[PDB]
Amino acid sequence: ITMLEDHEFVPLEVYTRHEIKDSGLLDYTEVQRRNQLHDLRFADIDTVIHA
């Protein structure tokens, strides 16, 4: 008679939530972030010209 040896079940999953989220071609959050930061980056949103 021999004891059943202890076993450690390491965490394991075929696809993590991060890669599941990244599976989609376009993510609305990042796309909108880039599109709405486009004005702030490639243009001045504070300088005012009056003449």
Binding site: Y15, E19, I20, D22, S23
Partner: protein, 52 residues
Amino acid sequence: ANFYVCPPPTGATVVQFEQPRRCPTRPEGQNYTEGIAVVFKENIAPYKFKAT
């Protein structure tokens, strides 16, 4: 709380002990082949590259 009377037995009924039964044998066991392995999964991740 019971009592019994056993008459002197005759040769009418004869009994025998069972012969030693053939003990079952251990299975040969799962013939295991060791070796390295690399499990592959379907590439759901897109093909990313830098574009300008």
